[PDB]
Curated annotation (Swiss-Prot), chain A:
High thermostability and very broad substrate specificity of this enzyme make it a potential candidate for the production of rare sugars for the food and pharmaceutical industries. The lineage of its organism: Bacteria, Thermotogati, Thermotogota, Thermotogae, Thermotogales. Binds 1 divalent metal cation per subunit. Mn(2+) is the most efficient metal cofactor, but can also use other divalent metal cations such as Ni(2+), Mg(2+), and, to a lesser extent, Co(2+) and Zn(2+), but not Ca(2+), Cu(2+), and Fe(2+). Pfam families: AP_endonuc_2. InterPro entries: Hyi_epimerase/isomerase, Sugar_Epim/Isomerase, Xyl_isomerase-like_sf, Xyl_isomerase-like_TIM-brl. SUPFAM superfamilies: Xylose isomerase-like (SSF51658). Mn(2+) binds at residues 149, 182, 208, 243. The active site is at residues 149, 243. Is completely inhibited by EDTA in vitro. Optimum temperature is about 80 degrees Celsius with L-ribulose as substrate. Is hyperthermostable, with an apparent melting temperature (Tm) of 102.4 degrees Celsius. This is 5-keto-L-gluconate epimerase. It is an enzyme of class 5 (isomerase). Homodimer.
Length: 269, 268
């Protein structure tokens, strides 16, 4: 297992200096604390100079292991299940741009809120539309790998559990799509988290950690010990990525606390 | 990767019944032999009931992966680099209609001979005119995807190689335009075909196969083995479309032979 830090960045639209500044500060932080990679999230990759980002990654010996896409939905309203097929097309086109960037870094592409919500429709129709969009994305890309992240009931009504995601994976039937499980979201939606992760097994491609209050791991009451024992049991050997609020004490303190908590869980395992 | 068959169809403006007949027979042939999709070519799409075509495609479970446009040039003289701006505009408008049809099917639009030739002008003038027309097409259409096909020296003096196409793609700067490579044409124009395909990489959007004599693959001396080795190595998961002379022994026999040859190289 390896440790990664999610870095928050300003949208480059907007303030290209702030994006660059945020990225460098975040990557320098991750390196100093001991993280082996970083994870980023961008709304629209078309407005970022990724050649410069690659140079920074090389300078710091810090790979980018995953790219989040959620702001495409939250800011731009793009959804892979949008009832308007024009917007569904634009969503697919946006995510293809994320895969172009992911290809530069060997990064996973995260399918979170960009999948969209039921919007008054049946779960069945929403799921069908989603599977169609993912199959289009797989037809459109030769190398991209995607991870579906179940999210809690307040963020979406579509794919709330690991089981929800596993059902979809079986219908997509491609090893280029897997699961991203998140402990903050699982703390709400999963009955028995170790059992949920065993059911995922080989399909668990990426992992997000934050405590029960979404603070740095160690600062709530989530049982990480049981989770890491299970990760060892299923042979999980990819990234454990810290995606938490900058609490307690700000972005730097949170990243350091998180690292110390996770390192102790991992090394004694 | 997936196998498709190019099927030839009469011009519907001249005989709409023959177009439908040719299309049905071609699509039934493809399904029977085991092709996963078909590719067609029409001079003018605005003359055909595409709604009926969609039903036929649906009823046969047989997608249309690409629409050819070359007859717009050969028959109607429409060119995306025509020196006459009025004709060039009509060429752009024709291809926009091709993209409407392609949109129904999620298909690619092929930019082959419709791009036109140098016609006494510099390569550079011809190229900038082409780039202008392609950018206009990208403005006029929202989701359409185009594939530029390099063609041999006897068919055109504009874009003869994959490397020339790559250079022009960089100047257009849109992932809605990529490359269609054809083995018959590459057999003449490419120095080293596997190296050319690797340089194309993810920008290789579509692929045409015919043997060295343009007969069914397996009936000439072209090295398909090395081509398919390379396509596997670069992770090609798009279409390989048979576009060959109806030889040997007719359209059906050619389609059968090509499929047998290619299926073998794909599975292994
Ligand atoms: Cu998360
Ligand atoms: Cu061809």
């Amino acid at each position: 297992m390896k440790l990664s830090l999610v870095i928050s960045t300003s949208d480059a639209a907007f303030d290209a200096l702030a994006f660059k500044g945020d990225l460098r500060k975040g990557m320098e932080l991750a390196k100093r604390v001991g993280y082996q990679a970083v994870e980023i999230a961008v709304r629209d990759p078309s407005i970022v100079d990724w050649n410069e980002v690659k140079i920074l990654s090389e300078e710091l010996n810090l790979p980018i292991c995953a790219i989040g896409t959620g702001q495409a939905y939250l800011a731009d309203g793009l959804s892979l299940t949008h009832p308007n097929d024009e917007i569904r097309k634009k969503a697919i086109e946006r995510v293809v741009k994320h895969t172009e960037v992911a290809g530069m870094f060997g990064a996973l592409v995260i399918i979170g809120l960009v999948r969209g919500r039921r919007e008054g429709r049946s779960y069945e129709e929403t799921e069908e539309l989603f599977i169609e969009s993912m199959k289009r994305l797989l037809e459109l890309t030769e190398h991209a790998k995607f991870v579906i992240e179940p999210l809690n009931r307040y963020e979406t009504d579509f794919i709330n559990t690991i089981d929800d995601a596993l059902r979809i994976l079986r219908k997509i039937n491609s090893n280029r799509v897997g699961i991203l499980a998140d402990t903050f979201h699982m703390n709400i939606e999963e009955v028995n988290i170790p059992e949920s992760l065993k059911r995922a097994g080989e399909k668990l491609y990426h992992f997000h950690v934050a405590d029960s209050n979404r603070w740095a791991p160690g600062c709530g009451h989530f049982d990480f010990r049981s989770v890491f024992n299970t990760l060892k049991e299923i042979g999980y050997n990819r990234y454990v990525s810290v995606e938490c609020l900058p609490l307690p004490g700000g972005m730097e303190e949170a990243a350091e606390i998180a690292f110390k908590t996770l390192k102790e869980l991992i090394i004694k395992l």
